[PDB]
Design a protein around this motif. Sequence first.
Motif, short mmCIF file in Angstrom:
data_model
loop_
_atom_site.label_atom_id
_atom_site.label_comp_id
_atom_site.label_asym_id
_atom_site.label_seq_id
_atom_site.Cartn_x
_atom_site.Cartn_y
_atom_site.Cartn_z
N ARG B 77 31.02 35.82 14.92
CA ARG B 77 30.07 34.76 14.56
C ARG B 77 30.62 33.39 14.94
O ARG B 77 29.85 32.52 15.34
N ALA B 78 31.93 33.21 14.83
CA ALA B 78 32.58 31.95 15.23
C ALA B 78 32.41 31.74 16.74
O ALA B 78 32.06 30.65 17.20
N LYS B 79 32.64 32.81 17.50
CA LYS B 79 32.43 32.80 18.96
C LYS B 79 30.98 32.46 19.32
O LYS B 79 30.75 31.62 20.19
N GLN B 80 30.01 33.07 18.65
CA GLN B 80 28.59 32.72 18.83
C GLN B 80 28.29 31.24 18.55
O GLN B 80 27.57 30.57 19.30
N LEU B 81 28.85 30.73 17.45
CA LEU B 81 28.55 29.40 16.96
C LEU B 81 29.09 28.35 17.93
O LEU B 81 28.44 27.34 18.22
N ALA B 87 38.63 33.65 18.80
CA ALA B 87 38.75 32.99 17.51
C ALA B 87 39.89 33.64 16.74
O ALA B 87 40.11 34.84 16.84
N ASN B 88 40.61 32.82 15.99
CA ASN B 88 41.54 33.31 15.00
C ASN B 88 41.12 32.71 13.67
O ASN B 88 41.16 31.49 13.49
N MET B 235 40.77 27.60 11.15
CA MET B 235 40.41 28.46 12.27
C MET B 235 40.91 27.84 13.57
O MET B 235 41.04 26.61 13.68
N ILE B 236 41.22 28.69 14.54
CA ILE B 236 41.57 28.27 15.89
C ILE B 236 40.63 28.95 16.89
O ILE B 236 40.32 30.16 16.77
N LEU B 237 40.16 28.17 17.86
CA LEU B 237 39.37 28.68 18.97
C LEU B 237 40.14 28.39 20.25
O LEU B 237 40.80 27.36 20.34
N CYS B 238 40.06 29.31 21.22
CA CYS B 238 40.73 29.13 22.51
C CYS B 238 40.19 30.11 23.55
O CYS B 238 39.47 31.05 23.22
N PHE B 270 29.75 31.14 8.48
CA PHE B 270 29.36 31.18 9.90
C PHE B 270 27.94 31.75 10.04
O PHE B 270 27.16 31.24 10.84
N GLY B 271 27.64 32.80 9.27
CA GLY B 271 26.29 33.37 9.23
C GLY B 271 25.25 32.32 8.87
O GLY B 271 24.22 32.19 9.54
N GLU B 272 25.54 31.54 7.83
CA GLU B 272 24.65 30.44 7.43
C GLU B 272 24.49 29.40 8.54
O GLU B 272 23.37 28.93 8.78
N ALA B 273 25.58 29.06 9.21
CA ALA B 273 25.55 28.02 10.24
C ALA B 273 24.77 28.45 11.49
O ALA B 273 24.27 27.61 12.23
N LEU B 274 24.67 29.76 11.70
CA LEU B 274 23.88 30.31 12.81
C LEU B 274 22.37 30.20 12.57
O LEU B 274 21.57 30.33 13.52
N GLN B 275 21.97 29.99 11.32
CA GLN B 275 20.54 29.91 10.98
C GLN B 275 19.92 28.57 11.38
O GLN B 275 20.59 27.53 11.37
N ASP B 276 18.63 28.60 11.70
CA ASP B 276 17.89 27.37 12.02
C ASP B 276 17.99 26.33 10.92
O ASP B 276 18.13 25.14 11.22
#
Lengths: 405, 405
Positions: B77-81, B87-88, B235-238, B270-276
Motif C-alpha cells: 500500500r505504501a508503494k501504491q501511495l 518500502a521498509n 518508514m523508508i522508501l527507495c 495507508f489504506g485510508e490514504a488510498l481512498q478518495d
Amino acid sequence: MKYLPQQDPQVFAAIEQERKRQHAKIELIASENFVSRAVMEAQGSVLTNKFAEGYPGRRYYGGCEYVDIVEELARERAKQLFGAEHANVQPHSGAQANMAVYFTVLEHGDTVLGMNLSHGGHLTHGSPVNFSGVQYNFVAYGVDPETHVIDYDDVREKARLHRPKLIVAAASAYPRIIDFAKFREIADEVGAYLMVDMAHIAGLVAAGLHPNPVPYAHFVTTTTHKTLRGPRGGMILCQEQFAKQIDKAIFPGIQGGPLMHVIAAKAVAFGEALQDDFKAYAKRVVDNAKRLASALQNEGFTLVSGGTDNHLLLVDLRPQQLTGKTAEKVLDEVGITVNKNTIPYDPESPFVTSGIRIGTAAVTTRGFGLEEMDEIAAIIGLVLKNVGSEQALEEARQRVAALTD
Amino acid sequence: MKYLPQQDPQVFAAIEQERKRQHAKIELIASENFVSRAVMEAQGSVLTNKFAEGYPGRRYYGGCEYVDIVEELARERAKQLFGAEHANVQPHSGAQANMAVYFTVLEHGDTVLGMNLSHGGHLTHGSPVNFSGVQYNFVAYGVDPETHVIDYDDVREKARLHRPKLIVAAASAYPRIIDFAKFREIADEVGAYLMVDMAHIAGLVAAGLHPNPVPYAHFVTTTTHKTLRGPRGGMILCQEQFAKQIDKAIFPGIQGGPLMHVIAAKAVAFGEALQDDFKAYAKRVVDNAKRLASALQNEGFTLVSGGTDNHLLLVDLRPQQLTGKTAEKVLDEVGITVNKNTIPYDPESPFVTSGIRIGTAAVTTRGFGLEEMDEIAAIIGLVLKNVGSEQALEEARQRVAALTD
C-alpha cells in the motif's frame, strides 16, 4: 474490535488468523509472552495522538499535563519494581535502550567487552552486522566448554587484556543465573562501566527469582516485553548520577517523540508486575522450566549447562545427530514453536545450529503447569525421535491440540 | 475500554483526561493529527505478542505467516501511495528511519549537507546534541533572508565547497514547496546521494498536493503520523537497487524486532490514504492553511515567506515585539495549542524564539473549515494584541470553547 473489521477487511482477517494461531500453537520461543487486555487497551488508546518530546514537566511542547502523569506512573512503578534511582521509559525497543547507553558513555571505536554471541550474547552486544559491532570495538568472553557457565576468569582476563571502557553482562540464550557481583568486581578492577542487559530475565528479577543487577550495574537495560510480560519496548535504569546524561542520550540523542500510548502500556505492565499474583506467576515460570528441563532429560535429551536456573533451556541435539534447523522445522509441523539456537562451541553455523532454545513464560501465562511440562517434553521426544514418521507427527499434532484445547 | 478501568484506575483516569483534552483544545501543532478508531484498534491488537525479526518470508522465527501478510499489506500500500519501488515499514520512528539511511550510506565522520536547523531543518538533520551531528560532519544550507525560500544557489555552493556524501532535503518548519528536482541536480553535480525527509508533508504528497520526492531521491524517509494521519512510527522508501542494503540497515543494523501491531496500524492508515476521501481531506488541509494564513495577515501578522504552500505557517512576531515563548504561553491559557519556533535569522535563542508555528492538519481532521480558520485567526489576534487583558483572554477562552463545542 468494532471499526477495523469494516474499515480494513484485509488487515482484520490477518489479525484474526494471528489471534487464532496464538491460541492453537504451543509457544516455546523464550522471549515470547501474552500481554493482558488492559495492556492492549492502553496501546490502543488516543495517546498515540500526543507529541511529547522531552520529559515530564520538562517537555518541548504544550498540553502534556496528562501524558506526564502517565510517564511518571511508568517511571515510579519501574523504580518500585527494581529499586533503581532513575528510570527512562522512552526507549522504543531493547536495541534503542542499549544504543542510548552506548551513546552515553562511549566514543566511536571504544573497546567494549560483551558475552560471546554464539555462547548466548545478543546481537546488540557486538555483532559485526549490528551498529554495536560497527560503531565500537567489541571483544567477547565465553562460557566453559564443559559446564557452559560463564567463565569469570575469562571475563577478567579479557577485561585486563583489552581494557574495555564498558563491560556488558546478560544474554538472550543463557540458562543459568548471572553473577553481577563478579561482573562489577571485574569492571572495578579495570575501571570500566558495567551495563547489564536484563531483557530476558526482567520479570524474574521483578519477582525476586533472579539476583537484581541494579545495585551492581551503572546502567541496566531491558525490554518491557518478554518475562516482564509488558508491551513491546525498551527501558533504562540507572543511579541518579547518570540520569541527566541517560535522558539526554534518549532525547535529543537517539530518538525524537516517545510512544506515549506504549508508555501507558508500560505503566500498566509495571502495575501488574507489582502485584502478588505476578510473583506467583514468575515462580511458576521457573518451576515449569525446571520441570520441562527434567522431563526432557528423562526423554534422553542433553541440555546446555545440564539444566536451567531461569525461564529458558537449550537442547544440545548433537547426540540425536540433528541440527537445530531440522528440529525447529519438524516441531513447526506439529504446532510447537521453538527456535534453532547456537549452542556454546557449536560446530554448525548460526543459520543451521546444533540446538533449540525453549522458554516457559508464554505457556505459563496460558495456565500450563508441571503436568503440561511433562507432556510437552513427551511430545518433543516423540517428534525428534521419529522425524521420518508421518504417523508419529500426526499423533504429536493431536497431543498438541489436546493441550491447547 | 473494558479492562483498563478495572485493572489500572490511575492510568485510565490519566488517559481519559487526555482524551477530553484532545477534544477541548484547538490543536495547531503542525505535526499533530487524530488517527481513526480502526488505526487505534490495530495498535491495540494481539500483534504486540509476536516476535518477527527479519522480513516477510525471510523471518528468523517461525509462526510469522499472518504478520507477514500484515507487513506486506503495509509495504504494497505504501508503494501504491508513493510510487516507490521498495518500502521498509519497520522503523520505530522518523528518527530511526533517518538513522538507518545514514547507517546505509555513510561512514563515521562523513560530510552531510542538510537544511539549517534554525531555518526549518530537523534535529536529526545535524544537531550537535543529536546522533546525526555527533556521528557525521553536518554542514547547512539556508533560506533567503527576505523571501525565506531555500536558496538553491546556497545549497549548490555548500555542496560544491564541502563535497558531502549525502544531501538531505525536507523540513519541520518550512511553509513552501521544496524543489526536489533542484536538490537532485545539485546532488548529481557533486556525486552525492539525495535523501528526502518528507515526514511533515507525506499526507500532502500522497494526495498529489506537494511534488513527490520519490522519483528524485535515492532515499525518502517519513513518519507515518503527521499529515499522513497514521500511527506513530517511521518508514523508508527507495528504489530496488538500495532495498537489500536499506532492509539490512534496519535489521540487523539498528533495530531488533519490529512492532507488528504498529505495522498493522500503518497498513490501516495507508489504506485510508488510498481512498478518495483522504485526497479531499488533504486538500482541505492546504486550503485551510492558506485561509488561516490570509486571515492572520488580515489581523496584522507577518508570516515567514509571506504565506504557505502546505499545511503549516510560521508567524514572525517581531512586529508585535513578542517572543514565541510569550505567545505560546498566553495561547495555552485560552486553549489554543501552538509551539514557539525559531524563524530564519532569528535574533532569539531556540528556547525563546521570535515565532510560533501553526498547522491545520489536526483541526481539519475534526471537520474545521474556512469559517473556522477566520475565527481562529481572529482569536489569535485578540489574544496576542491584548496579552495583559484578562477580560480579552476570557473572551478568547469562550470563543475557543464555541469552536470545540
